Amino acid sequence: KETAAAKFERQHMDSSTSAASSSNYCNQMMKSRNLTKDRCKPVNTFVHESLADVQAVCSQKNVACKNGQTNCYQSYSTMSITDCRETGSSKYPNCAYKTTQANKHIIVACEGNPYVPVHFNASV
Secondary structure (H helix, E strand, C coil): CCHHHHHHHHEEECCCCCCCCCCHHHEEEECCCCCCCCCCCEEEEEEECCCHHHHHHHHCEECCCCCCCEEEEEEECCCEEEEEEEEECCCCCCCCCEEEEEEEEEEEEEEECEEEEEEEECCC
């Protein structure tokens, strides 16, 4: 089965672009990354940085995850991200999203050996 690490890359990484370039970014990326295959995932965040810089977060500032777990880490620096939120007109299978660009610090949960990100927790 797809690993947790691989899933994190598929759902959250976009090292191919520096930022979302148009209002259709989320619509296209949510579909292409197969995140709307079974249902319309409500929210999703894409990270426009190298995978190595994101993996390195696992060795950055340790913080509690939103739920209280302590295997979370916050990036020392801000990162370019794109927030995707379902719109009022979204209707499975034609899922629809609003694209929002931002620059913030990311918080991920890490696991394994090598110790890598497996969950996107929040952006602050």
